[PDB]
Structure 1
Amino acid sequence: KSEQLLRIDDHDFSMRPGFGGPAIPVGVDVQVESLDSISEVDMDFTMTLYLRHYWKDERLSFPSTNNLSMTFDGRLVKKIWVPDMFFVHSKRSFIHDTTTDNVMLRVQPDGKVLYSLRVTVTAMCNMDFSRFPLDTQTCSLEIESYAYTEDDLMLYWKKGNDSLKTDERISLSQFLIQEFHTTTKLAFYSSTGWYNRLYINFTLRRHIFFFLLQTYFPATLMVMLSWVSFWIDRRAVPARVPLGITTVLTMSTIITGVNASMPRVSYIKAVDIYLWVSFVFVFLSVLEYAAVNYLTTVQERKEQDTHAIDKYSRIIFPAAYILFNLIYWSIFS
């Protein structure tokens, strides 16, 4: 029997190796396989990865006439001591079990142990949509021991920044992923003490042009169309009102559609400011004509060319819109 080469019954595996002395160093190697999905309403992302652990345990040493290693399946995990890593700030996770448990153990003759497994984890990530759609989001994934403090277990990356590998085909439907790097930081819990924590960081960016076209182009086009009505003669009363009254309806439909398409984030964003300012510029154009029409009628009654209001509007409106655009794109870059 292979398990008889390891003195399983002659050793206690309920305690850590090197009990009562210096901590046992444990190395971790992570390989990212894919990114499944990201949810903006609930602010979470899903990841699939390979997790590996390295440590040395002298109780598992077995004699041999060569350097061949022995491979065991997941059934040996319950009989020996293994590190209990867990993911912080996670919502749910599981280990794949098709067609059997995806757990592997490899033991060297001296006693070096390799522990590999495949896991899928969902983690939280705080997001800020103030600068939508020009926003940049940074998320992270954290790994930490559960029950052992730094006095008993010393956790670290095995090969520095070479311990993180990513698949060549990792991609998202609506985001750009870049800048994968690893950091470490000590965390404190008042109940037990100090712990070591490992981080995996990355950054997300959007496709600016798609939002630019769809949102901003119709708004500017409709504003210019509303401007155009200033060059039509005032005497054609049933030929100037329809343009102004039919620009507002189109703007309202555009706003409703854009609101429907965007994610349900309930606070003011950068896109909302642009759309509601443009709505006022269209609204004021109709108010301008009512004043012109009213003043003309008063003169006719009193007494019985181009009005100066139109001349001033043709210059004032484009300047105001250009100044607003300059300020808006200077603030939001």
Structure 2
Amino acid sequence: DFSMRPGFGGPAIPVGVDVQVESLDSISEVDMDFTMTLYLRHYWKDERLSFPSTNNLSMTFDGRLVKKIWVPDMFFVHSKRSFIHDTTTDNVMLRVQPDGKVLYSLRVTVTAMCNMDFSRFPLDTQTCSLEIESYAYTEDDLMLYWKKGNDSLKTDERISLSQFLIQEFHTTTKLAFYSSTGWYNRLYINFTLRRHIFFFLLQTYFPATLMVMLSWVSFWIDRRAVPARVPLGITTVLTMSTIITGVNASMPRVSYIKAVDIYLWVSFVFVFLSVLEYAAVNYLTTVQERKEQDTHAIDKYSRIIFPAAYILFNLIYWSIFS
């Protein structure tokens, strides 16, 4: 009866795992998941599978035999969807040796949930993992381990992504507990991710800075030229508002506060204050004309104060986000 595991009732059966990674097919920021294609290999010794031959060499069967014999039942923990490839036929392999050591191999694609924090965007780093576990059998019945330690993971040379950079592949293990079912062995495949920083500096942190620098030109124009100093500021407000909407249309769409939002909103406040400045100046000059019937003090102070505050802002901001 190939429904009972090898060594039933006695000690747990040692099953060993080997993995090779093919590709990383996609990543979704809004749904917080990633998709991967890999090869998965198993090993064990079963005597009901022995045969009399002198060759001392393995012999090959396929998926049809897999539905007759007994086989492990690993599954992917914290997955959203997976499948096994089937063209032009099932991507399954089964090799059987004279002494009874089986090898069993699959090709699969998995989508796995990854929790991500965007508060430092775009200067963040994300960490993700793939988890492997047996579904039905506890650690007293089935024992699970990496076949050759840290060397039981292999990775493909052309694995790439359009939005990210990948580094630091390694394996770990950990024991897990379910309250209604027991203690299970679990294996992990970990890696790290990062973005192209110097592109975001030019896409977002550059136009805003130029706009704030453009609002300071007003302090050097003659206060007598009202039809020239009034339209300049409000057009500058318009430009900055347009920019803040273009950046939002090109970003992934997240609804809590991010690093880049802070910088843009502060630049906006600097440009709004410049408009209030000249309104004060105009009003004071006008009441002086009325009272009686050279650069203004507020102009020659603004020319110093505004840039220095912006410089202080930048120092603190980049001390916090580094």
> TM-score normalized by structure 2?
0.99
User: Aligned partners of 2:218 and 2:315: how far apart in 1?
Assistant: 24
State the identity %: 100
Tell me the residue number matched to 1:51.
40
- Look up the SS of the partner of 1:79 in the other structure: coil
- Look up the SS of the partner of 1:297 in the other structure: helix
Tell me the residue number matched to 1:284.
273
Residues 1-333 of structure 1 aligned to structure 2 (within 5 Å): 12-333=1-322
User: Aligned partners of 2:57 and 2:207: how far apart in 1?
Assistant: 70
By how many angstroms is 1:246 displaced?
1.0
Q: Deviations over 1:204-247 (max 9, x none)?
A: 00000111101010001000000111011101111111221111
User: Aligned partners of 1:65 and 1:265: how far apart in 2?
Assistant: 65
> TM-score normalized by structure 1?
0.96
Q: Deviations over 1:64-109 (max 9, x none)?
A: 1222321001000111110000001101111000000001000000
By how many angstroms is 1:153 displaced?
0.3
Q: Deviations over 1:239-262 (max 9, x none)?
A: 111221111111000000001111
User: Aligned partners of 1:300 and 1:126: how far apart in 2?
Assistant: 65
By how many angstroms is 1:114 displaced?
0.2
Q: Deviations over 1:148-206 (max 9, x none)?
A: 00000000000000000100000000000000000000000111210000000000000
User: Aligned partners of 2:314 and 2:58: how far apart in 1?
Assistant: 69
User: Aligned partners of 2:186 and 2:217: how far apart in 1?
Assistant: 62
Runs of 4+ in 1 over 6 A off after TM superposition: none
Unmatched 5+ residue regions in structure 2? none
By how many angstroms is 1:14 displaced?
0.5
By how many angstroms is 1:60 displaced?
0.6
User: Aligned partners of 1:56 and 1:258: how far apart in 2?
Assistant: 59
By how many angstroms is 1:268 displaced?
0.5
Q: Deviations over 1:118-164 (max 9, x none)?
A: 00000100000000000000000000000000000000000000000
Note the aligned Cα RMSD (angstroms): 0.6
User: Aligned partners of 1:217 and 1:114: how far apart in 2?
Assistant: 57
User: Aligned partners of 1:156 and 1:168: how far apart in 2?
Assistant: 26
Q: Deviations over 1:250-294 (max 9, x none)?
A: 100000000111111001000000000000000000000000000
User: Aligned partners of 1:195 and 1:90: how far apart in 2?
Assistant: 17
User: Aligned partners of 2:91 and 2:234: how far apart in 1?
Assistant: 66
User: Aligned partners of 1:80 and 1:199: how far apart in 2?
Assistant: 28
Unmatched 5+ residue regions in structure 1? 1-11
User: Aligned partners of 1:221 and 1:112: how far apart in 2?
Assistant: 69
- Look up the SS of the partner of 2:106 in the other structure: strand
Q: Deviations over 1:26-57 (max 9, x none)?
A: 11001000000000000000000000001110
